[PDB]
Amino acid sequence: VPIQKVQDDTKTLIKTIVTRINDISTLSKMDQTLAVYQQILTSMPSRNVIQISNDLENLRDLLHVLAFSKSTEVVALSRLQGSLQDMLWQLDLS
Amino acid sequence: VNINISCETDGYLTKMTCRWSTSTIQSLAESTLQLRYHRSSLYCSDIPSIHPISEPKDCYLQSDGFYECIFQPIFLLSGYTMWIRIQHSLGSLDSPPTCVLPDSVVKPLPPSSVKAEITINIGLLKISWEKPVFPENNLQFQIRYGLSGQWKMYEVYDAKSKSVSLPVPDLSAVYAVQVRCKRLDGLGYWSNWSNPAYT
């Protein structure tokens, strides 16, 4: 598996989660942020949240692969979308 | 005869449906069958293999004789290694394992909002459409057009393209237009042809 395709798949997975959120309506800090959001999503399970929480798990793993190679539900997901869009452009600056 | 397992992730990326035949299986009717799978943390292995730690999957026999198993929710980038455990009269008989990545087996939705307009002054038909919400990857489009009542097809590879303009032999005639899309990298299925748009 090529590392560039891992990066292409990371950027793509982020866009997918951002799109999932609106349809309802360096790597260490990104990982630390996702971990906090996962804990939040685990306290508010729903059909969409459970799917998003699974994607968040895949995104954290993709972040670790890169390092070693070299309604309250609406409000919570709205903040997460902001954080996700932040990572999406920061990954380009590599 | 080995058992072929084919999977397809829906256009909304919520589930993956897998199917396996029983036609090249009727020879050994006396035997219990069960689909087994092993989920990888990320991506598929270069060579799939039977793993000691596996989980069974609930498959349901359909009218066409195929078993349908639904994985929901889905881990889009986790490697699903599957096989059929056969117990004909004693012991274990595992079919050849195949690994599938749900993100690379997505069948996208047909592109919404298809419009076909003939502008006389230009002499072309501006076929326009809207990309389906999922997948987020780059897409290639295929357009089929012909006399409403003879079909030449055109391919568009620019991912950032919403519309195109093609020539016709008769600007007065009524033409039926359909569009379909697939992942530009080839890792995916073609969507169904959109509802026909008329000039």
Side-chain angles (χ1 to χ4, degrees), chain B residues 8-19:
Chain B
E8 174 196 281
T9 307
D10 73 324
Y12 302 100
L13 316 182
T14 62
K15 60 159 187 167
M16 179 183 65
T17 309
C18 301
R19 297 167 89 254

Side-chain angles (χ1 to χ4, degrees), chain B residues 126-139:
Chain B
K126 192 199 170 183
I127 301 157
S128 176
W129 63 84
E130 292 293 328
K131 165 220 165 59
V133 277
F134 290 114
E136 285 295 285
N137 306 84
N138 305 335
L139 303 174

Side-chain angles (χ1 to χ4, degrees), chain B:
Chain B
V1 185
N2 64 296
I3 304 163
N4 191 34
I5 306 173
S6 70
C7 303
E8 174 196 281
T9 307
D10 73 324
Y12 302 100
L13 316 182
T14 62
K15 60 159 187 167
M16 179 183 65
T17 309
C18 301
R19 297 167 89 254
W20 61 284
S21 57
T22 48
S23 59
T24 70
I25 278 94
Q26 302 296 316
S27 67
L28 307 175
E30 190 251 357
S31 51
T32 176
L33 305 167
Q34 181 190 55
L35 189 137
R36 308 283 293 187
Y37 77 96
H38 174 81
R39 205 192 97 238
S40 320
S41 306
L42 272 189
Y43 299 106
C44 271
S45 307
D46 285 279
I47 301 169
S49 63
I50 304 298
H51 196 71
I53 305 174
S54 68
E55 309 154 78
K57 192 66 196 185
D58 287 288
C59 301
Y60 309 103
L61 186 60
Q62 305 298 301
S63 60
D64 56 13
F66 276 77
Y67 279 95
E68 233 182 59
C69 336
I70 292 174
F71 288 86
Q72 190 179 334
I74 196 63
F75 284 97
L76 300 170
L77 296 175
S78 286
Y80 288 78
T81 314
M82 308 160 183
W83 65 93
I84 308 296
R85 182 144 299 164
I86 306 161
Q87 294 211 21
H88 68 111
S89 70
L90 249 173
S92 179
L93 282 89
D94 302 331
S95 77
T98 54
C99 190
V100 62
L101 198 67
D103 191 22
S104 58
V105 292
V106 174
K107 178 187 174 191
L109 315 110
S112 72
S113 317
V114 184
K115 294 175 190 62
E117 285 178 317
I118 300 173
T119 43
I120 301 172
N121 73 302
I122 303 301
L124 297 172
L125 18 78
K126 192 199 170 183
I127 301 157
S128 176
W129 63 84
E130 292 293 328
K131 165 220 165 59
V133 277
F134 290 114
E136 285 295 285
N137 306 84
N138 305 335
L139 303 174
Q140 49 174 310
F141 301 91
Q142 191 163 298
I143 302 167
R144 68 172 168 190
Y145 61 102
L147 275 170
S148 180
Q150 341 94 330
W151 295 81
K152 293 292 183 177
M153 311 195 184
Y154 186 70
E155 293 72 36
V156 184
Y157 300 100
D158 199 345
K160 311 173 187 175
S161 64
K162 173 161 294 192
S163 184
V164 84
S165 293
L166 304 169
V168 284
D170 189 4
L171 296 171
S172 274
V174 184
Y175 294 102
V177 179
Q178 287 179 295
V179 193
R180 70 167 185 173
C181 54
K182 177 175 172 168
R183 283 187 59 198
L184 190 61
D185 62 354
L187 303 179
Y189 294 136
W190 279 102
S191 70
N192 288 328
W193 288 100
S194 65
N195 293 332
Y198 303 106
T199 60

Side-chain angles (χ1 to χ4, degrees), chain A residues 9-90:
Chain A
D9 287 353
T10 303
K11 279 183 290 182
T12 289
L13 179 58
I14 291 174
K15 300 177 186 175
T16 297
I17 313 173
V18 168
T19 303
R20 276 214 168 84
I21 304 189
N22 56 48
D23 187 49
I24 287 164
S25 314
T26 57
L27 304 174
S28 64
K29 189 67 184 172
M30 300 187 179
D31 183 73
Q32 176 196 316
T33 304
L34 300 180
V36 169
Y37 279 121
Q38 278 186 314
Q39 290 159 24
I40 293 168
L41 300 190
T42 306
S43 74
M44 45 162 60
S46 89
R47 178 179 57 90
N48 324 279
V49 158
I50 288 300
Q51 180 59 61
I52 293 164
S53 218
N54 277 11
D55 291 323
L56 255 57
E57 204 174 322
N58 289 333
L59 187 57
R60 286 191 79 189
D61 289 339
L62 281 175
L63 279 171
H64 277 84
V65 165
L66 295 172
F68 309 136
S69 71
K70 193 94 82 173
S71 309
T72 53
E73 179 149 322
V74 188
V75 182
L77 292 172
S78 294
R79 293 299 259 105
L80 169 56
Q81 189 179 61
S83 305
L84 284 174
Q85 287 164 334
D86 197 38
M87 302 174 192
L88 185 59
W89 38 72
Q90 285 187 20

